[PDB]
Write a protein that binds this ligand. Structure first.
Ligand SMILES: N=C(N)SCc1ccc(Cl)cc1
Length: 330
């Protein structure tokens, strides 16, 4: 089997991407944030505290003839921004782009934090990291990909995120028309539960490439590119007027600037992030100070190749017995 679904930015800044997902019988379609940095599939639901729902589409398990309460199971998760959610668990039929999994754990939110409430466009998350990170207790549950894998034509999924435009998540096949040149594959460590890999270096604009190992995660659920302070300082030093602002919480730059590109290495290959991809717009409405899309990972504890980086590539998440990651230009 295979599946193919369009993913769409939630706003004009590409702050996140949503992908329609069919849950239950008859289908209830929710728009979920596909997140290769976590491993829970959770949804706003009929059980979510009413004051914490503001415009989201909810899953109502009582209206699904295939829903079954997973007795005794609960879940609770936090995210990199400090947002969180928790609840109980059903199993139900879940389909993404024509690919169906029966008995998928669907984690129903009883509580969500304010940042989820405030985002009317995201009805929940669909985790695509390794199932070892799944938070269901007392019996850990498998991700959608992990459940689908044995049925797939090939044990892979691909992320093809758009810049200010829709893109695609494919399951079970590599669309050879979706990228240019060749796909360069690189080793993955699953030891921390993430798609963790090592970039071979970077360049700023038309500058020379610096060969240096940068260990980080391929994370579709993170908006920006978080890299070591040395690398980030080198980037922003090429933008007149750019500075790190403690009050704003990162690097900002004059909105009148033309940003340089940023290149990262994947083995001997190079992915070029155009400068425009690094502009996240005014820090507040009407401001001439703009927020940068490359930020320091110091204090996070890990480097994160988020959407800013991933959207510049066609990315293969290879879930073979020994997982790997593939990157191609597009
Ligand atoms: N994508 C997610 N759900 S969390 C990404 C993340 C952020 C920080 C650290 Cl330390 C690890 C992972």
């Amino acid at each position: 089997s295979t599946g193919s679904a369009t993913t769409t930015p939630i706003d004009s800044l590409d702050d996140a991407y949503i992908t329609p997902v069919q849950i239950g019988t008859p289908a209830q379609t929710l728009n979920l944030d596909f997140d290769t940095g976590s491993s829970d599939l959770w949804v706003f639901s009929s059980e979510t505290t009413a004051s914490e729902v503001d415009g989201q589409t909810i899953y109502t398990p009582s209206k699904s003839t295939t829903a079954k309460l997973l007795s005794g199971a609960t879940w609770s998760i936090s995210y990199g921004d400090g947002s969180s959610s928790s609840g109980d668990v059903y199993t139900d039929t879940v389909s993404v782009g024509g690919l169906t999994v029966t008995g998928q754990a669907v984690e129903s939110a009883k509580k969500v934090s304010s940042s989820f409430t405030e985002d009317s466009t995201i009805d929940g998350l669909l985790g695509l990291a390794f199932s070892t990170l799944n938070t269901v207790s007392p019996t850990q549950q498998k991700t959608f990909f992990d459940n689908a894998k044995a049925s797939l034509d090939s044990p892979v999924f691909t992320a093809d995120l758009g810049y200010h435009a829709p893109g695609t998540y494919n399951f079970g096949f590599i669309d050879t028309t979706a990228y240019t040149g060749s796909i360069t594959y690189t080793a993955v460590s699953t030891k921390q539960g993430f798609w963790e890999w090592t970039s071979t270096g970077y360049a700023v604009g038309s500058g020379t490439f610096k060969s240096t190992s940068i260990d980080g995660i391929a994370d579709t659920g993170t908006t920006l590119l978080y890299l070591p302070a040395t690398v980030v300082s080198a980037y922003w030093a090429q933008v007149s007027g750019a500075k790190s602002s403690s009050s704003v919480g990162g690097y900002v730059f004059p909105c009148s600037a033309t940003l340089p590109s940023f290149t990262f290495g994947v083995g001997s290959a190079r992915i070029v992030i155009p400068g425009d991809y690094i502009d996240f717009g005014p820090i507040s409405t009407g401001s001439s100070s703009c927020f940068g899309g490359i930020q320091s990972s110091a204090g996070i504890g890990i480097n994160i190749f988020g959407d800013v980086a991933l959207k510049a590539a066609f990315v293969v998440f290879n879930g073979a017995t020994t997982p790997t990651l593939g990157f191609a230009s597009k």
